[PDB]
Design a protein around this ligand. Structure first.
Ligand SMILES: Nc1nc2c(ncn2[C@@H]2O[C@H](COP(=O)(O)OP(=O)(O)OP(=O)(O)O)[C@@H](O)[C@H]2O)c(=O)[nH]1
Ligand SMILES: *CC(=O)N(C)CCN(C)c1ccc([N+](=O)[O-])c2nonc12
Ligand SMILES: [Mg+2]
Ligand SMILES: [Mg+2]
Length: 166
C-alpha cells in the first residue's frame, strides 16, 4: 500500500502528541507524559487515494543527538510544530528546519509549519509572522488545535501533498 512516512518535530510541550492522537484516534489528550518516540499507523483516505500514514511522534528535547537522528532519518515528511503562545518554540523552528535538512542530507525536504493551540487566546506569535516565516522557507503554514480539532486534518494532509509533490 501507498505509505507516507511522517515525523512530528518541535519543542517540548507544543502539542505534537495531542495533534497526532487527535488524528490517529479522534480525541484530545491532556496528561503529564514526557514523550519519547512512539509511532502510530492508520489507513486513511486522502483525495481519493487510499494510503497508510506511519507517524513518528518525537520527544521535545533541548539537546540534539545521533539517537534522535537515527529515528528521524526514516521519515519522508516533517510536521514542524510550535505553540502560538510559546515564543521560544517558534524561534526553535529555524533549528529544526536546519536539523531536518542535515539529517535528510537535502535542500528540499517535504515540510509544513504548524502553529498549535489555536483555541488559546492572548497569542504571543502573530499569525502574519509565522505565515511570513513559512513563505520565506517556501512551505505551507497551517494553524491548529489538538483541542477543538480545527486544522488538524489540514496540517497532516497538506504534508502528504508536499510528500507527493517532491
Ligand atoms: N489548549 C490546548 N492545549 C494543548 C493543545 N495541544 C497540546 N496542548 C496541551 O499542551 C500540553 C503539551 O502537549 P503535548 O502533546 O504533551 O506536547 P509535546 O510537544 O508532545 O511535548 P513533548 O513530548 O514533551 O515534547 C498538554 O497539557 C496538552 O494537553 C492545544 O491545541 N490546545
Ligand atoms: C508532570 C511532570 O512533568 N512531572 C512530575 C515532572 C516534574 N515537574 C513537576 C516538572 C518537570 C519539568 C518542568 N520543566 O522544566 O518544564 C516543570 N515545569 O513545572 N513542573 C515541572
Ligand atoms: Mg509528546
Ligand atoms: Mg519544497
Amino acid at each position: 500500500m501507498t505509505e507516507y512516512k511522517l515525523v512530528v518535530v518541535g519543542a517540548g510541550g507544543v502539542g505534537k502528541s495531542a495533534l497526532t492522537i487527535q488524528l490517529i484516534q479522534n480525541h484530545f489528550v491532556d496528561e503529564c507524559d514526557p514523550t519519547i518516540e512512539d509511532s502510530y499507523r492508520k489507513q486513511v483516505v486522502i483525495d481519493g487515494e487510499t494510503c497508510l500514514l506511519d507517524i513518528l511522534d518525537t520527544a521535545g528535547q533541548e539537546e540534539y543527538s545521533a539517537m534522535r537522528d537515527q529515528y528521524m532519518r526514516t521519515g519522508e515528511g516533517f510536521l514542524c510544530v510550535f505553540a502560538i503562545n510559546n515564543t521560544k518554540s517558534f524561534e526553535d523552528i529555524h533549528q529544526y528546519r536546519e536539523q531536518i535538512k542535515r539529517v535528510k542530507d537535502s535542500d528540499d525536504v517535504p515540510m509544513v509549519l504548524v502553529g498549535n493551540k489555536s483555541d488559546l487566546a492572548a497569542r504571543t506569535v502573530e499569525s502574519r509572522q509565522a505565515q511570513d516565516l513559512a513563505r520565506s522557507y517556501g512551505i505551507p503554514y497551517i494553524e491548529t488545535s489538538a483541542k477543538t480539532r480545527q486544522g488538524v486534518e489540514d496540517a497532516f494532509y497538506t504534508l502528504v501533498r508536499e510528500i507527493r509533490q517532491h
